[PDB]
Amino acid sequence: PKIHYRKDYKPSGFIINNVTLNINIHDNETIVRSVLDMDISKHNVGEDLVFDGVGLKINEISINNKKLVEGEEYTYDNEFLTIFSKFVPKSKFAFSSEVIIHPETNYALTGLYKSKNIIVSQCEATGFRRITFFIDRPDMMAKYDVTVTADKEKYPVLLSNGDKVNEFEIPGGRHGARFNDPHLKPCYLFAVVAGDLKHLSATYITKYTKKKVELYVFSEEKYVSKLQWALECLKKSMAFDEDYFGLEYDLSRLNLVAVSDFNVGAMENKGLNIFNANSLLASKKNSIDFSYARILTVVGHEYFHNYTGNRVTLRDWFQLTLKEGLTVHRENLFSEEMTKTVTTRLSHVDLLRSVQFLEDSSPLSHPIRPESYVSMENFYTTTVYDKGSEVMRMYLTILGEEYYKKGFDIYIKKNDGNTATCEDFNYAMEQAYKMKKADNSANLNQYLLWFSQSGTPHVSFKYNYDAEKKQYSIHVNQYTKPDENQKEKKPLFIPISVGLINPENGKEMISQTTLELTKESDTFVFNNIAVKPIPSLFRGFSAPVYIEDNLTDEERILLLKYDSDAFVRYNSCTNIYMKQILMNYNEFLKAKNEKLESFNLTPVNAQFIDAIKYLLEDPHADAGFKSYIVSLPQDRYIINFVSNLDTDVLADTKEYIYKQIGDKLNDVYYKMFKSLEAKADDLTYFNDESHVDFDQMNMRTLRNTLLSLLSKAQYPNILNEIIEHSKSPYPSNWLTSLSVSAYFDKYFELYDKTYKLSKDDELLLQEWLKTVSRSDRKDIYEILKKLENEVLKDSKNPNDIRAVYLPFTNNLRRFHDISGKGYKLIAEVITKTDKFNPMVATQLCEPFKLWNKLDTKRQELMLNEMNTMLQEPNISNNLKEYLLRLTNKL
Ligand SMILES: Cc1cccc(CNC(=O)N[C@H](CC(C)C)C(=O)NO)c1
Numbered sequence: 001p002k003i004h005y006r007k008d009y010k011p012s013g014f015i016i017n018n019v020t021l022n023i024n025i026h027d028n029e030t031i032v033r034s035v036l037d038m039d040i041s042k043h044n045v046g047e048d049l050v051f052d053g054v055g056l057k058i059n060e061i062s063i064n065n066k067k068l069v070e071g072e073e074y075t076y077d078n079e080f081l082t083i084f085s086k087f088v089p090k091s092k093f094a095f096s097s098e099v100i101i102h103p104e105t106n107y108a109l110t111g112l113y114k115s116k117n118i119i120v121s122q123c124e125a126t127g128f129r130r131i132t133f134f135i136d137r138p139d140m141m142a143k144y145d146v147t148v149t150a151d152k153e154k155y156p157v158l159l160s161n162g163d164k165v166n167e168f169e170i171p172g173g174r175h176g177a178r179f180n181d182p183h184l185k186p187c188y189l190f191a192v193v194a195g196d197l198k199h200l201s202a203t204y205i206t207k208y209t210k211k212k213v214e215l216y217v218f219s220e221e222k223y224v225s226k227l228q229w230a231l232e233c234l235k236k237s238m239a240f241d242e243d244y245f246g247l248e249y250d251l252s253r254l255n256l257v258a259v260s261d262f263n264v265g266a267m268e269n270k271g272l273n274i275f276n277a278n279s280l281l282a283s284k285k286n287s288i289d290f291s292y293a294r295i296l297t298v299v300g301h302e303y304f305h306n307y308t309g310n311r312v313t314l315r316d317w318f319q320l321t322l323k324e325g326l327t328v329h330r331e332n333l334f335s336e337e338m339t340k341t342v343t344t345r346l347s348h349v350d351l352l353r354s355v356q357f358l359e360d361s362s363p364l365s366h367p368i369r370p371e372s373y374v375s376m377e378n379f380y381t382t383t384v385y386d387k388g389s390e391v392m393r394m395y396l397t398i399l400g401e402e403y404y405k406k407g408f409d410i411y412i413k414k415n416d417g418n419t420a421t422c423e424d425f426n427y428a429m430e431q432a433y434k435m436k437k438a439d440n441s442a443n444l445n446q447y448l449l450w451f452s453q454s455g456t457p458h459v460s461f462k463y464n465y466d467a468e469k470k471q472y473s474i475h476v477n478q479y480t481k482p483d484e485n486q487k488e489k490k491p492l493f494i495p496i497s498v499g500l501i502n503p504e505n506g507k508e509m510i511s512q513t514t515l516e517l518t519k520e521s522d523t524f525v526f527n528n529i530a531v532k533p534i535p536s537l538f539r540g541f542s543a544p545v546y547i548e549d550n551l552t553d554e555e556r557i558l559l560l561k562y563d564s565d566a567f568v569r570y571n572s573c574t575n576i577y578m579k580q581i582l583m584n585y586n587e588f589l590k591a592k593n594e595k596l597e598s599f600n601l602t603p604v605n606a607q608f609i610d611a612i613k614y615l616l617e618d619p620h621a622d623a624g625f626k627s628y629i630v631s632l633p634q635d636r637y638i639i640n641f642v643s644n645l646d647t648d649v650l651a652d653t654k655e656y657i658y659k660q661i662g663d664k665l666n667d668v669y670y671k672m673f674k675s676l677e678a679k680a681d682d683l684t685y686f687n688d689e690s691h692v693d694f695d696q697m698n699m700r701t702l703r704n705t706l707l708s709l710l711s712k713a714q715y716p717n718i719l720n721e722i723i724e725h726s727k728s729p730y731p732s733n734w735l736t737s738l739s740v741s742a743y744f745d746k747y748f749e750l751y752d753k754t755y756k757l758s759k760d761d762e763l764l765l766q767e768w769l770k771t772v773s774r775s776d777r778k779d780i781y782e783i784l785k786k787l788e789n790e791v792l793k794d795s796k797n798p799n800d801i802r803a804v805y806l807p808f809t810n811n812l813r814r815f816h817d818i819s820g821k822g823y824k825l826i827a828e829v830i831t832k833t834d835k836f837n838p839m840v841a842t843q844l845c846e847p848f849k850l851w852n853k854l855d856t857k858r859q860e861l862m863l864n865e866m867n868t869m870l871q872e873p874n875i876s877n878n879l880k881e882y883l884l885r886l887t888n889k890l
Pocket residue numbers: 124125264265266267268301302305324380381382383385386
C-alpha cells in the first residue's frame with residue numbers, strides 16, 4: 001500500500017494563486033472548465049508537475065494556451081495527471097483543463113453528486129480532485145472565481161462560496177451565476193450547490209464592527225417549514241463566538257443548505273455550509289427532542305470552523321485535530337452555554353469513555369496526531385475529534401478562562417489567513433502559560449505528548465489523613481499501557497480538578513483547585529483539613545483518563561448524594577455499578593464454565609439503591625441527572641474492563657442488576673413517571689421553532705427512561721400507560737411507546753400506528769427505522785428482513801442504511817448471537833455498501849472494533865467475517881486499510 005508519513009511533509013514546488021471555474025450542469029454530464037493561475041515556489045527543483053485528478057474524463061489540457069497531448073507532454077492514469085517537466089514553465093503560468101464528470105451516478109457522495117434533485121459537492125478531504133485537477137492538499141491556498149450554469153426550471157438556485165457578483169440568462173432555458181470568494185482557501189473548502197431550493201433568511205449585525213450579514217438557510221420545498229431552528233442556532237453561534245472569543249463573521253452572506261444524502265453531519269465550506277438534513281432540519285411535530293440538540297451542535301460546529309479551520313487552516317492532514325479537536329471543544333463550550341444543563345457535559349464524557357476509549361484500546365488505536373495513513377479518510381475518528389477536544393479543553397482547565405482567551409487570541413491572530421500545525425497551537429498556549437505563571441522559563445513541552453502518544457492513561461489514587469496534624473494527602477499515579485505506537489509510554493501533563501467533601505455534613509472543605517500531575521507519581525498534601533475528607537476527583541472530567549478512585553461504595557454514595565460536581569457524582573455512581581457488574585459477571589461466568597447446578601450472586605448494595613430513591617424523590621434535583629443514575633453504564637464502557645467478554649453473560653448480568661433495583665424502586669419509578677407528566681409534556685413553545693427548553697426535554701427523557709424500566713419489568717397495568725403515551729403530540733414520546741411496547745403483544749399494532757405517523761416525513765421515517773431497529777424483540781431478525789423488504793429496499797441513502805442496521809448492532813443479546821448470524825448480516829451490508837460508498841461501509845464496520853475483546857468463539861466468528869470482507873474483489877482502499885489495521889495485518 002502507498003503510505004504517507006507525517007515526518008516526510010515538504011512544501012510544494014508549485015503555487016496556485018487563483019482558480020477560475022466554470023461548472024456547466026447538464027442532465028447526463030457536467031463539464032468543468034478550470035484555469036489555474038500558477039507559479040513556481042522557492043522549493044522547486046524542476047520536477048514534473050503532478051496534479052491529483054480521480055475519475056475525470058479529459059476534454060482538453062493546456063499551459064499558456066499551448067495544447068498538451070497524452071503520451072507526449074502529459075500522462076493520466078485516472079488518479080494523477082503528470083505534466084513532464086520540460087513543459088512546465090519556469091515562472092508564472094496559466095494551466096487550463098476541461099473535464100467531464102457525472103454527479104448523477106456519484107453514489108459515493110464525495111466530489112460533485114446528486115442528492116435527490118439537488119446537485120451538491122463534498123470536497124473534504126480528497127473530493128476536489130474528483131471535480132477537477134488540483135494539487136489537492138490543504139497547504140495549496142488560492143482565491144476562487146466560480147461560475148455555475150444549469151437548466152433554470154430544474155436548478156433555479158445556484159450557489160458557490162462567497163459574493164454573488166453576477167447572474168445571467170443563457171439560451172435554451174439555462175442560466176448562470178458567478179461567485180467571488182475573496183478569502184484565500186484550500187480546495188477542501190470549495191462548494192457548489194444547484195437546486196430548486198427554498199429558504200428562510202435574516203439579517204445579523206456584528207457586535208463590534210456592526211457589519212450587516214445576510215443569513216440564509218435552504219432546503220428542498222417539502223421541508224422549508226423545518227428550517228427555523230437552524231437559523232436561530234446560527235444566530236446563537238455567531239453571538240457566542242463574538243461574546244466568548246471576540247470573533248466576527250467575515251463575509252456579507254452565510255448560507256446553510258440541507259441535503260438528503262450526506263456521509264456524516266455537515267461541512268464548513270466557506271460561506272456555504274452543507275448539512276445532512278438530519279443535522280439541520282426539524283419541526284416539533286415531526287422531530288424527536290434529540291434533533292434539536294443535534295442541530296444546535298452541528299450548526300455551531302460548522303460555524304466555529306470559520307476561524308478554527310477556515311481563517312486558520314491545516315498545513316497537512318496529520319494536523320486534522322488542530323481544526324476538529326479545537327472546533328469540537330468550541331462547539332462543546334457553546335452547547336454547555338446554550339443548554340445550561342449538566343447533562344450536556346455528561347453526554348460528551350459518556351461518548352468519550354464508551355466509543356473513544358474502546359477505539360484507544362483496539363488495534364485501531366492512534367494518537368490524536370497520527371504518524372501515517374493510506375486513506376486520510378480513516379482518520380476522521382472519535383480519537384481525533386473527541387479525545388482531541390478533551391486535549392483542547394485541558395488547556396482551558398490549566399490556564400483558566402482569562403489566560404485561555406489570551407492564548408487562543410495569540411494563535412488565531414498570528415496564523416490568520418495561513419496554515420498551522422499542532423505545534424503552533426501549543427506555542428500560543430505556552431505563551432499564555434508563561435504569563436499565568438509569571439515565569440518566562442515555564443514551558444508546555446511535555447504537553448505535546450498528548451498529540452503524539454496513543455492510548456488512555458490510567459490514574460489511581462491512595463489517601464492518608466493525619467487527624468492530629470489536620471493534614472491530608474492524595475498520592476497519584478499514572479500509567480499508559482504500551483501499544484503498537486509506543487513500546488515505552490511517558491508520563492503526561494494531567495490536570496486534576498479536585499475538591500474535598502466533609503462526609504459528616506456533605507460540605508466543601510477547600511477552594512476547588514487543579515493539581516498538575518507531571519510525573520509518573522506524585523503526592524499532593526493539604527493542611528487545615530479539619531476531618532478526614534472524601535475526595536472529589538477529576539471534577540468536570542478534567543482529563544481524558546481511566547480513573548481508579550480507590551473509594552468504598554459508602555464513600556461513593558456520599559459523593560453521589562452530596563458532592564457539588566455533576567461529573568464526580570455521576571462517576572461515583574458509575575463506579576458502584578462497575579464494581580457490581582464485574583462481580584456478577586464473574587459469578588455468572590464461573591457458573592456457566594463450571595456447569596454449576598447452583599451458585600450465588602452478590603446483591604446490589606442496598607444503601608446505593610436507597611441513594612437512588614433519595615435523589616429521584618428530591619423535587620429539586622435535576623431530571624436529566626436522574627436519567628443517568630437509573631441507567632447502567634453503556635455496554636461499550638463496560639467492555640473496556642473485561643477481557644474475553646462473553647456477551648451473553650454480560651446480558652444476564654445487566655438484567656439481574658436492573659431487576660434487583662426495580663424490585664426495590666418500581667413503585668417510585670411509576671409515581672415519578674406520573675408526577676412528571678404535567679411539566680414534561682407542557683406545550684409551552686410547541687409552535688416556537690426559535691426556543692427549546694432543555695430542562696423540559698430532560699424531563700421527557702427521564703419519563704421515557706422510567707417507562708422503559710417499568711415496561712421491561714412488566715409493572716402491573718403499564719400497557720395502559722404505554723397506550724396513552726402513544727397519543728402524545730411529542731414524537732420523542734410516541735416513538736418511545738413503540739420501543740417500550742416490545743415487551744407486549746401490542747408491539748405490532750404500535751409498529752403500524754407509528755409507521756403511519758412517520759412515513760410522510762423522510763427524517764421522521766428514518767427515526768422510526770431506528771426505533772424498530774433498537775427494539776428489544778426476540779424476533780428482531782425477522783423484523784429486519786421486513787424493514788429491508790418493505791421500507792429500505794434498494795436505498796443508497798446513508799441515513800436509511802444506518803437507521804436500519806446500526807441500532808440493531810447495539811443489541812447485546814441478539815447481534816452477538818453465538819451462531820454468528822449477526823456478524824454475517826452486518827458484514828454482507830458492509831460489502832454491499834462498499835461497492836458504492838466506501839466511507840459509509842467503513843462506518844458500518846463499527847461493531848467489529850471490539851472483536852479482540854470478546855470470548856474466543858465470537859472472536860473467531862468476527863474474524864471470519866472480516867477476512868471474508870477483505871477477500872471481496874475490488875474492495876475499496878478505505879475498507880481494506882480499515883480492516884487490515886483492525887485485524888493486526890497493517
Ligand atoms: C468523531 C467523528 C468522526 C468522523 C466524523 C465526525 C463528524 N461528522 C461530521 O459531520 N464531520 C465533518 C467532517 C467533514 C469532512 C464532512 C466535520 O467535522 N464537519 O465540520 C465525527
